[PDB]
Amino acid sequence: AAKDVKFGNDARVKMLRGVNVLADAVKVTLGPKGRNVVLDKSFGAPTITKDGVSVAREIELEDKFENMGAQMVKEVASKANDAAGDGTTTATVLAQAIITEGLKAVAAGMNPMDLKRGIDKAVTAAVEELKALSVPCSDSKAIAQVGTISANSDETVGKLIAEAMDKVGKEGVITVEDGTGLQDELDVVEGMQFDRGYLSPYFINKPETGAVELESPFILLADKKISNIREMLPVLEAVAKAGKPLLIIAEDVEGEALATLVVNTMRGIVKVAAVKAPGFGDRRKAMLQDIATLTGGTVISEEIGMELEKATLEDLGQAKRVVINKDTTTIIDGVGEEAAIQGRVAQIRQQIEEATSDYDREKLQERVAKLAGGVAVIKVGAATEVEMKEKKARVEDALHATRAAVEEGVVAGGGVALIRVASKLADLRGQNEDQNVGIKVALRAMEAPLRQIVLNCGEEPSVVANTVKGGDGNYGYNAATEEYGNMIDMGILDPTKVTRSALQYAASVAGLMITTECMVTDLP
Amino acid sequence: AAKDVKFGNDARVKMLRGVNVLADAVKVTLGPKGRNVVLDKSFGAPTITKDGVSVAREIELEDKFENMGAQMVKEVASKANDAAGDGTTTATVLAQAIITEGLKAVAAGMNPMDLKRGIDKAVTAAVEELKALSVPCSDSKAIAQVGTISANSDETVGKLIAEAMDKVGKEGVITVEDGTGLQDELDVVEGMQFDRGYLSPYFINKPETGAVELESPFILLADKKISNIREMLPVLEAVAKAGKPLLIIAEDVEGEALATLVVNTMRGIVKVAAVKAPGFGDRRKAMLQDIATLTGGTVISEEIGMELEKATLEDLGQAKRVVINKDTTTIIDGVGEEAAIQGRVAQIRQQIEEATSDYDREKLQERVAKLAGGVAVIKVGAATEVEMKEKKARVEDALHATRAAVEEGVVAGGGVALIRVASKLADLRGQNEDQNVGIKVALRAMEAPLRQIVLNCGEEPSVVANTVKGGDGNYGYNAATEEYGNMIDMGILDPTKVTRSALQYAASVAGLMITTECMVTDLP
Amino acid sequence: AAKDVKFGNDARVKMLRGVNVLADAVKVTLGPKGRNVVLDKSFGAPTITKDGVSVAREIELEDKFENMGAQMVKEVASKANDAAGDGTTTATVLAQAIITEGLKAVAAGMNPMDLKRGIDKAVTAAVEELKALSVPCSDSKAIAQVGTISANSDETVGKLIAEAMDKVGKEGVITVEDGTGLQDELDVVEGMQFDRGYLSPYFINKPETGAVELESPFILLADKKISNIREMLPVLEAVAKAGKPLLIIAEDVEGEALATLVVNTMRGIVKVAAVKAPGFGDRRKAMLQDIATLTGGTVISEEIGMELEKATLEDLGQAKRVVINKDTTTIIDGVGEEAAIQGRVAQIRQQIEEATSDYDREKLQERVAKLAGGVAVIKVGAATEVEMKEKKARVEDALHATRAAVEEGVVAGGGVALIRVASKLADLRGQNEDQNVGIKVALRAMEAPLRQIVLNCGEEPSVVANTVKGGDGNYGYNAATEEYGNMIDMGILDPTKVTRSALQYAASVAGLMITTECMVTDLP
Numbered sequence A, B, C: 001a002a003k004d005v006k007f008g009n010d011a012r013v014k015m016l017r018g019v020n021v022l023a024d025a026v027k028v029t030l031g032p033k034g035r036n037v038v039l040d041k042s043f044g045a046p047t048i049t050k051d052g053v054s055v056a057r058e059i060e061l062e063d064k065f066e067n068m069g070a071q072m073v074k075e076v077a078s079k080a081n082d083a084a085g086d087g088t089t090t091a092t093v094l095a096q097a098i099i100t101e102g103l104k105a106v107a108a109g110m111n112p113m114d115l116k117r118g119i120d121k122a123v124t125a126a127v128e129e130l131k132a133l134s135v136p137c138s139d140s141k142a143i144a145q146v147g148t149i150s151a152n153s154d155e156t157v158g159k160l161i162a163e164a165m166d167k168v169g170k171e172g173v174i175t176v177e178d179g180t181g182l183q184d185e186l187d188v189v190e191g192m193q194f195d196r197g198y199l200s201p202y203f204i205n206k207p208e209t210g211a212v213e214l215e216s217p218f219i220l221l222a223d224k225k226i227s228n229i230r231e232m233l234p235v236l237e238a239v240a241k242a243g244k245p246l247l248i249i250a251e252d253v254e255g256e257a258l259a260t261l262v263v264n265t266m267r268g269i270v271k272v273a274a275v276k277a278p279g280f281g282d283r284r285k286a287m288l289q290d291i292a293t294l295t296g297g298t299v300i301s302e303e304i305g306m307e308l309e310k311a312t313l314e315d316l317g318q319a320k321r322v323v324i325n326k327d328t329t330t331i332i333d334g335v336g337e338e339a340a341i342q343g344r345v346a347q348i349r350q351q352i353e354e355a356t357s358d359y360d361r362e363k364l365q366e367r368v369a370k371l372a373g374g375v376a377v378i379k380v381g382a383a384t385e386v387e388m389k390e391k392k393a394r395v396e397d398a399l400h401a402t403r404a405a406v407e408e409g410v411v412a413g414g415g416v417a418l419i420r421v422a423s424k425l426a427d428l429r430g431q432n433e434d435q436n437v438g439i440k441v442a443l444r445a446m447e448a449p450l451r452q453i454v455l456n457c458g459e460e461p462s463v464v465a466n467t468v469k470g471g472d473g474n475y476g477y478n479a480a481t482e483e484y485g486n487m488i489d490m491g492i493l494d495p496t497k498v499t500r501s502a503l504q505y506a507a508s509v510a511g512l513m514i515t516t517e518c519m520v521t522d523l524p
């Protein structure tokens, strides 16, 4: 279609105005005294959120050039959310400050490319300084503090996330889901448990609980669908001779084979239960091999070479306990070699490193959590769905922040880390004066998060920023209590990964944005 | 016509928005780093001004409630200009700050009447504290500093005004008018000189200069129009017998009498000049009596009792020198009793105290300046008419500020005096908590002038305000040099009358404005 | 009415856009290769002009803020036209360059007041440097060159103006009026000649020419209206006894006195002519006294003291020749004392110095030209009225430029003088860096006239400006021939007053304009 074209100051002013609209919508949420934003939904009730990425995503402007600026700056929050799952508001505030100061420098006649180069150099040095300033976050107290800060000073969320991390260890997988009550609950499942119930309700050994309970049972892992009993007959004879129970994880058991297994279960000759193999094609075999390694057994398939008829007792896996319910099956203390389990876990880790998808890598992380460590589910407790959504967003932010803190350490919160980093970079210089001004605007923008936090408290950002800059180390401003002190001591910890990602993404987008001389958009 | 009626928060928000429009237009001019405002004129070129009263006068808003707020707050600048001729921008900034904080308090549910009472109490205490803090401004250096500060750091204007004040003394009258050259000129006329030229060009004793020059002449003061020579004949005979020149200040000389005076002037029998009596009905007699007192003579009139025929040499006044030009007549060193001159000056001062009009009181002040002291005219030098208007406005501001400083003393400039006064009133309390909040909002608004001055410099108002508050006495912030120091030492002096008037008028208007619950205006 | 208020960058951009509209309309006329502008007239034919003041006056913009900028910058051209009668386009180009560079500096964050101070300091130093660089323009060749350059390389206009200046001398008065033919004519009248014809056609001594010619006649100067012959009778008897002719310059001769003068003229007893006294009340007496001084006579009036009855031959004036036509009367070689004539001329010069009106001062300048020197009229020759208007404007520009060159000297034309002055001011510095930038923008704007002259030629302004700057002295660029050389040698002379006035007025308006932060205008 026909295009509206704007140049120089007018285009830059409109882009800055759109950026300011989005950033003003987002910055009101920053900090302990940050407020909430209501986002209208065409289908459903409005959403109340403190997450700056949601606010940024909902922002779209009528003016095409202002909307261009808003959409360009929305990428900062989107990338911060995709990478660190937190710091999106800080990223947006940083991007807005960089854009404002860089456009001021451009209006002063300096070369925008050199300003962008100076910003990039300052941010690279800043990332190095943040890495130097980061301290490890390994104790449960620090993890709880990080979760509490990320959950908007919600101590319960931080304590729950720290407890979940302790229960599931380093290799465990933690997810957040909706709850039914008003209180947040933590459900931790250890060892292996897959969402595959019994193939027949008649298998239930314990009627009062409706769950098959097998003590020290054999494990028959079949990678092929089973419909007849001829293939499985010798295994059943061997199991009955042994006298121990049997659990058959198969692709599908149905028809005559299921029926005769049921009759044999009541007749007491063999206490046998059958469950479906978890997963689907090209992934079900992986879980079957994982269960075989955990239980010290072997998978029966056409591709591997042997058939179910020739399966023996040594072929079958071994486990201390097995519990089957209507939906899930749990194998407790599988009798398998620890070295093989560790090797398979390392192989899955290597595939995760080779993985290029978030969903896939999460699936193999869950597989690792089943093989070693545990799986935790945090059920968010709330009275209404709007409160559920807000609290779940905060809990997800806290979970992401705790993971980032465990991975890359922690720094002083409340924008103090960026203050200290910018103070450490006062002597940084570029190739020319324009690059020096770019470095200076990056350093000044590094103070924007603390200033916005203070402004959201109703205090004077300049006075508090000067007081924090006059301090050293982890000295800073507790905005919740409006008091100065050591941010590590008061538990205001920011994940180093979150701060670094916010700075990097804001810098990239804003440095590209300050170099713009012409905008081309659709005519109104 | 039909009326739009608004209540409570909506009306107050619209009023505050209009106030903010006017105050934002006006505050950009505040301080040494204040900028200029262009005001469009329907007939003529646009006017560039730094005077906040002009900007406030030009402001009128489309929205009727916003316009109501703007018009109400315009009264602050108008009253400051009418009273002190300076501080209108400071008055407007103070009024805006009081309105903003008082509306914040009203939105918090406190009684607006009690807030207004607290504001009034705080401002009364503030005026008392300003009176206590004021130091006399009598030396020429302090007067020049006040004029320089009021003229936007124009040292030449301050020095010129100090020189004019020194030349014309305490009782002299100084006016400002347009000039012809590019430089500001000072024209000081001492003793008595009235804008009445000779009644005939033939009276000129000195053709090379075109001015009658009479050395030790007699003075004939006639309060009646003269057309014949019979009434004036014996006076002419006595003057010719004496041999000294004669100057006739009359209501009007014309016809035969003027002709025979002309012939006698060339014939050398009597060197006589005739001029019109300055002023008009009920005021010309006053100037005639003033000249009679100065020259030790008597006025001839029908009402007093004697006629011109019976006038003698003792009736005539005496002066050392008389110079008549085409437009003005000057009497130098009139031979009159000093005690009578002082008594007449005191009588005119008493009438000035009894006077209730600015134009009238200025007229008798000019009469006093003719009788004693001098009259100074400052011709503003500029290249163009727009520059002439701007510089003349600045020079008028400096003249008003110097007069106010002479009258009521000086305090630290740059909003420092209000800072110190507000600090001295921290313990002030009202009858109830709402009055205490009113006192607090008045004290906080007292910091608005310094904060706006700093903001106009591009610096951080909060940091500089805190630094100034941490100081004591005349410690403050030179915004021109952006350095801290003693404002009296650096010559940043504010007239105490100007600061007090700004505070009082802002307080009155803003305290009345924060009490408004309903607005009634015309429908759009 | 309701007001539209704009702030900062938006207001400044609109003001600059309006300034650019006016300056783009005006700059196309600059220089020898400047084109013409057509200005529409509501009543009458369109006007084709090269004068930048006319173009600036006709400019008015729909957008109120753009119109504000245009009206403000129009003052530069108006003031240059009022002061020097030339250089209005140069003044406008200078003002536009200063505004553009100063707004660039303001957008860079420097203090506009300090930029204005730096501009003013640079322009004061520039005026001093122009005074130093100026050389006197006294020879007829230089005057003709100045007139030719000012008349857009019209050699005939320059030669005619030089001839008029030579004929009327220093004290003569030159005016420009419409002609009847296609060629420019010069009519020079020496001695005294006033536009007052004979009071009766019967006075004509020479019927073939219709003009009274009196050889060595007496001069009777009467300041009163004459209607009877009794008052004038003894003068007539004395004149008839002497036998020489008589010319009566009177307020009015009519009725019986005129009739008997007519009869006596034909009867040959006395060859007498009567003319009306030139001028009106309070000015006719001045011309009568001038004629009396020139002819060595005395004016008869009631105020002076003597009557027409007592007038004698010695009272009457004397002249060598008198020529009366239907409209004008000329007195050739009046027999009067040279010292008295010089004294009266000096007195009129003193009144001119005391005069404060252009029309009045021109009237007394014409009186001086009648008393001493001569009066020249340049009748502009053109085929049509549009060509007449254009050529008359050019001739008026040339006359003003020649007067300015005679008064204050000449400098190198084509913007070279401003180039050299700016080069001489490279070391000039202000109090702070912002004042230094103001000085720099003034110096850069000093190159705008030459650059615009070159651009109007279709050449590269930057290359030619660099070449001229690389030269020294009067080296520069002849744009008419597009060749480099000595501008004085090629006759491209600019009056120093014109260049200085253009720079000063442009500087004042533009320095005030760059300090503007807010504009208030009427809503659309």
Ligand SMILES: Nc1ncnc2c1ncn2[C@@H]1O[C@H](COP(=O)(O)OP(=O)(O)OP(=O)(O)O)[C@@H](O)[C@H]1O
Binding pocket: A029, A030, A031, A032, A034, A050, A051, A052, A053, A085, A086, A087, A088, A089, A090, A091, A149, A150, A152, A153, A397, A412, A413, A414, A415, A449, A453, A477, A478, A479, A480, A481, A492, A493, A494
């Ligand atoms: N009590 C506190 N005192 C000072 N700063 C605090 C306090 N609590 C949290 N902060 C700071 O507030 C910031 C976190 O604010 P917030 O969670 O609103 O935004 P975010 O992390 O940038 O983004 P998101 O909207 O994605 O959660 C961090 O810089 C953190 O250090």
Ligand SMILES: Nc1ncnc2c1ncn2[C@@H]1O[C@H](COP(=O)(O)OP(=O)(O)OP(=O)(O)O)[C@@H](O)[C@H]1O
Binding pocket: B029, B030, B031, B032, B034, B050, B051, B052, B053, B085, B086, B087, B088, B089, B090, B091, B149, B150, B152, B153, B397, B412, B413, B414, B415, B449, B453, B477, B478, B479, B480, B481, B492, B493, B494
């Ligand atoms: N160099 C300076 N440093 C600090 N403050 C200064 C300086 N020069 C002037 N001021 C302050 O600026 C104020 C005067 O500013 P300005 O003249 O713009 O406004 P005003 O007096 O309120 O009103 P008006 O518009 O009627 O002149 C005073 O408070 C004065 O003390």
Ligand SMILES: Nc1ncnc2c1ncn2[C@@H]1O[C@H](COP(=O)(O)OP(=O)(O)OP(=O)(O)O)[C@@H](O)[C@H]1O
Binding pocket: C029, C030, C031, C032, C034, C050, C051, C052, C053, C085, C086, C087, C088, C089, C090, C091, C149, C150, C152, C153, C397, C412, C413, C414, C415, C449, C453, C477, C478, C479, C480, C481, C492, C493, C494
């Ligand atoms: N042949 C030439 N070569 C170079 N410069 C020239 C030449 N002739 C004239 N100029 C220059 O052109 C300028 C005069 O141009 P112009 O008459 O169009 O404008 P102006 O004097 O600024 O204003 P106005 O419109 O009032 O006449 C002067 O600077 C003069 O020196």
Ligand SMILES: [K+]
Binding pocket: A029, A030, A031, A034, A050, A051, A052, A089
């Ligand atoms: K947030």
Ligand SMILES: [K+]
Binding pocket: B029, B030, B031, B034, B050, B051, B052, B089
């Ligand atoms: K002001």
Ligand SMILES: [K+]
Binding pocket: C029, C030, C031, C034, C050, C051, C052, C089
């Ligand atoms: K021109």
Ligand SMILES: [Mg+2]
Binding pocket: A086, A087, A088, A150, A397
């Ligand atoms: Mg967060």
Ligand SMILES: [Mg+2]
Binding pocket: B086, B087, B088, B150, B397
């Ligand atoms: Mg002032």
Ligand SMILES: [Mg+2]
Binding pocket: C086, C087, C088, C150, C397
């Ligand atoms: Mg010209």
